[PDB]
């Protein structure tokens, strides 16, 4: 099955600064890569779909980029409400798979 590897595993940042999170697929998945945010005691929240498509109700500071095997989730000027876990998920082939996640923490 498709394996998604996320890096770094953890990223510390000070509110106001920007960050970019990486997700790489073991094989090409076109643009079928989505990004989720998950906080303790809460269900995942879809942030970006199909690599770079925006989602209504999500802060504009979130953007996605990439195609094939290398993808990135960027947060322009991190806010405290952004601290938590970020997971990428591919839907190009069944079974759908998730990356191991990147933890974003305050520095």
């Amino acid at each position: 099955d498709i394996v998604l590897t996320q890096s770094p595993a953890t990223l510390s940042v000070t509110p106001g600064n920007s960050v970019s999170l990486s997700c790489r697929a073991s094989q090409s998945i076109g643009n079928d890569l989505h990004w989720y945010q998950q906080k303790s005691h809460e269900s995942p929240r879809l942030l970006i779909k199909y690599a770079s498509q925006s989602i209504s109700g999500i802060p504009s500071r979130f953007s996605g980029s990439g195609s094939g095997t290398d993808f990135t989730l960027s947060i322009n000027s991190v806010e405290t409400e952004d601290f938590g876990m970020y997971f990428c998920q591919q839907s190009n082939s069944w079974p759908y798979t998730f990356g191991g996640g990147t933890k974003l923490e305050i520095k």
Partner: protein, 410 residues
């Protein structure tokens, strides 16, 4: 159905901008060399410091670039277009696009000033391919195609006629997996992304105008009427202006089942004039009218004739050798896949394989146009014609796909 079923957007453009652009590729006898030709037009004030650069990339690698300022060649007694420019880039040993190998390039069109400042940029994917009918055969890059295709509607059991990337992609992959080369946009221009995916995954596309007047009597009634000429005209012209740069599109179609009227003849000529890179097809009025470059019937049998008055359907093998006939024949719809069907499919495949001028066809059709309904316990079930108290209706007639609405195969 009805509503705002495709996207809504906002686009912010500069005041002085790129208003349109087209791409074209010519080749030499053996395709070892090509010319990419880009015609650009702009809107706004024309200032001598304005320039255009068209660059061709292959990956990270720039392959060719050209720069120039506005102002075309003399066209007639009054001059040329001052707001247009055409560049021509030479490309040696271009990688060719085909459904077998979708070689693509990226073309960037920059509108800048001479001091290097960028006003704005546009782009598109480019595929080097030549489409021609020659000597009764339809050729792609010099060889003759054999279209393994299917007709596909924009249908989602849940979303009705709203399309999404996931669905498009699913469809594409199923098709490719199942030995399809091509798809027909039955029977209107599709959601934009579609072409792009085809361009990229590799499928030949027949782009079709949104014109079907099947229910008139006779069929011709509006299409033969000059008063509908304008309305029709816009359905064809805009399609072309919009999709003309996609490599996957290899044939233009005037619509569907609207008989054969003088309006078609005009529109067919229009296209030929505007974009001679592709052939035009239209089945209405007998499948072999003066408005089609290809004999493209629907449901013609292999060996048996169905000689309806006015618009018979000869056996395909026979149709080709009718006196004076020389065009290639590709079925716009054949092998009606409604329910427990597809008997005889092989007969077709065999003719296709034995007769050169029989270059395949489009099966009818891809997905079942069934919709989801819910029962007394929030249990879903597949609904069809008349199941929404809809009147009048055609019941199961909306289910002729090769795959179920959920994309599971029949």
């Amino acid at each position: 159905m009805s509503g705002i079923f495709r996207d809504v957007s906002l686009l912010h453009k500069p005041t002085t901008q790129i208003s349109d652009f087209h791409v074209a590729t010519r080749f030499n006898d053996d395709f070892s060399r090509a010319v990419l030709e880009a015609e650009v037009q702009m809107c706004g004030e024309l200032r001598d410091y304005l320039r255009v650069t068209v660059s061709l990339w292959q990956g990270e690698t720039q392959v060719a670039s050209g720069t120039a300022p506005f102002g075309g060649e003399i066209i007639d007694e009054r001059g040329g277009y001052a707001d247009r420019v055409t560049l021509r880039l030479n490309v040696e040993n271009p990688k060719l696009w085909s459904a077998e190998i979708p070689n693509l390039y990226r073309a960037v069109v920059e509108l800048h000033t001479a001091d290097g400042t960028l006003i704005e940029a546009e782009a598109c994917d480019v595929g080097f391919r030549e489409v021609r009918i020659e000597n009764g055969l339809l050729l792609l890059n010099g060889k003759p195609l054999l279209i393994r295709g299917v007709n596909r509607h924009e249908h989602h059991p849940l979303h009705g006629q709203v399309m999404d990337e996931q669905t498009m992609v699913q469809d594409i992959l199923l098709m490719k997996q199942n030995n399809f080369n091509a798809v027909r946009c039955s029977h209107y221009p599709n959601h934009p992304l579609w072409y792009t995916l085809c361009d990229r995954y590799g499928l030949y596309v027949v782009d079709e105008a949104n014109i079907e007047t099947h229910g008139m009597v006779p069929m011709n009634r509006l299409t033969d009427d000059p008063r509908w000429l304008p309305a029709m005209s816009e359905r064809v012209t805009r399609m072309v202006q919009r999709d003309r740069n996609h490599p996957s599109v290899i044939i233009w179609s005037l619509g569907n089942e609207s008989g054969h009227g003088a309006n078609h003849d005009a529109l067919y000529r229009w296209i030929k004039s505007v974009d001679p890179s592709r052939p035009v097809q239209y089945e209405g009025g007998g499948a072999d009218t003066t408005a089609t470059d290809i004999i493209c019937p629907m449901y013609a049998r292999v060996d048996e004739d169905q000689p309806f008055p006015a618009v018979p359907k000869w056996s395909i093998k026979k149709w080709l050798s009718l006196p004076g006939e020389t065009r290639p024949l590709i079925l716009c719809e054949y092998a009606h896949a409604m329910g427990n069907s597809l008997g005889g499919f092989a007969k077709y495949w065999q003719a296709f394989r034995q007769y050169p001028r029989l270059q395949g066809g489009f099966v009818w059709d891809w997905v079942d146009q069934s919709l989801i309904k819910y029962d007394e316990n929030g249990n879903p079930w597949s609904a069809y014609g008349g199941d929404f108290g809809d009147t009048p209706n055609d019941r199961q007639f909306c289910m002729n796909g090769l795959v179920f609405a959920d994309r599971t195969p029949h």
